[PDB]
Nucleic acid binder design. Sequence first.
DNA 1: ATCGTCGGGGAAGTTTCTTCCTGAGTTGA
DNA 2: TCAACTCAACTCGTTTCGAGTCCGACGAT
Lengths: 146, 148, 149, 148
Amino acid sequence: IICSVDIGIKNPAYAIFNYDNTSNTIKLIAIEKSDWTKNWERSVARDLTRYNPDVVILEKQGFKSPNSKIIYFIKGFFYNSNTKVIVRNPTFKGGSYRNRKKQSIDVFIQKISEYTDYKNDILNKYTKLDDIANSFNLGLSYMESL
Amino acid sequence: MIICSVDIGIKNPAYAIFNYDNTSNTIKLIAIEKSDWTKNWERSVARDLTRYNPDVVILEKQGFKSPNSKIIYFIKGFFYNSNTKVIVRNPTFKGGSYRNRKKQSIDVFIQKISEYTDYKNDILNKYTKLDDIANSFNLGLSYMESLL
Amino acid sequence: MIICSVDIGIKNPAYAIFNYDNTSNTIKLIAIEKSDWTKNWERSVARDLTRYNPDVVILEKQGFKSPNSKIIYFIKGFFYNSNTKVIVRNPTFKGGSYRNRKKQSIDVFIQKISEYTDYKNDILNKYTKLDDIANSFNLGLSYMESLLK
Amino acid sequence: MIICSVDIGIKNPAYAIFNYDNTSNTIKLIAIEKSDWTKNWERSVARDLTRYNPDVVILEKQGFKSPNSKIIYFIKGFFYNSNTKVIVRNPTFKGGSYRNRKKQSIDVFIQKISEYTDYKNDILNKYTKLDDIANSFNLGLSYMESLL
DNA sequence: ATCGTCGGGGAAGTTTCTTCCTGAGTTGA
DNA sequence: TCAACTCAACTCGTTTCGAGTCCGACGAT
């Protein structure tokens, strides 16, 4: 069970998948944009223990945002536990910054439907800038490169 | 009631382990040591903090610009959902910048150690670089003073 | 009366040396000089002020939040021995903006020097900044004008 | 040589006049007084300093917060001519508490006052207050120890 | 003194300002 | 990590990493 997280005080988001390795049996369990402003450490632990994951995928950031403190908190929380937290270098923000639309809507409209069967169920009531894109793209890139 | 107060730092981290007798207000020094968190610092932090299975972990607050902050949240996440509360206390000595901070720390240490360990000479004779174990001891003792 | 009026300051101190006739009430400008007190100011003050051993030394009142006050009190102690009266006058040019003092000072200086030196041009060329020698000249001349009563 | 140590202040200035026998290290206290510099402080200062013709005058350095600095520079200009060495020493007891600054001062005072005058009758019966003449005497004695 | 505004290290000698020297961030390799 | 370079207050949640406060210097009356 794979859990990919877009970290940030802006709009944190997480996606929970189950991927059968090398078998191309992808199952999307959930995708959500949460809020980590009220009791953020308690809220982070509560959101991470919902569907106890085996791997957590994060985007590495510099000093740009306090979201790094969430990265180190997550590393400490799941350290001895069975899960393994891995922080991937930022693909995101390479050269230009006006390249979201293409990859976001393309990968969504192409690949969300075959895994959850609730494509438009989330589309009709979710709309945000750079949370579902970062989280889903990190998770899907890890799974495709897996 | 096992107290573990830590002076944080990647180069010279230090920790003091006290025993506070509940309802008796009895301070008994269990141990005081310093370690190194250079190679795979997460393993070293976890081991040094779980060494004596404490009930409270005391850390000293740093500003928003230091690697010591990264250790703070790792420890907070590590001991979260446990019967071991990590608390981040303000800097005990917050007066003089350099000449008063370290010297006042090691002075109050050398003066207040005698009533707690009964092994004063053996600890003073080893290190001679006291300004980390001194900070940890002062942090722990300040937390205990704030207990009553 | 050999009179020495001083515009005080570490960076560019200045002084004007006059001769005042006691029974004629006539002004005579002897000299006007800039100096430097940026290094060893007590030695420099003692040297520059005793250069033309005066009978009166006039200083301009300074506030307490300036090094000119310590120079004032050093001079007070120095000449408190004999033969030299140190007198501290209120700033002659007073009021309005601070820069209005400088321009008014150098203006009255430029327009009133000709009647005293006959070497007006040598002073305008050497030491082009005029806002210290003006202060010293105006201080001395104001004291001597206030001497009649 | 005749040594004159001054506790400066418009509040209650004080001075101690010692006589040091040259090459014998014999300290003899000539006088101790609490003067007043209220009206025409320059005249009063000059009178009090020229009362006993000294060879050195010892002052305690002050911060630029009080007219005592103007008195210091007045003294420097006054004795600058010749014959005198005005020395401005920092306040001797540069340590511990401020409330203990007077305690140790008057302690060293009461410790060493008896051995210097041999006419301590009028002086013992004279005054019930110390916290100015004590400071002046301690400054003077510190210079006397720093003399050899 | 008094209201508005600003900066926030220590020690010693060239002394009440200047000239240093600390010892911790912080920053690119 | 690490070695050169730059530069000095505290501090509380401000639902606990950054935006808030406090306390002595100047400037101009």
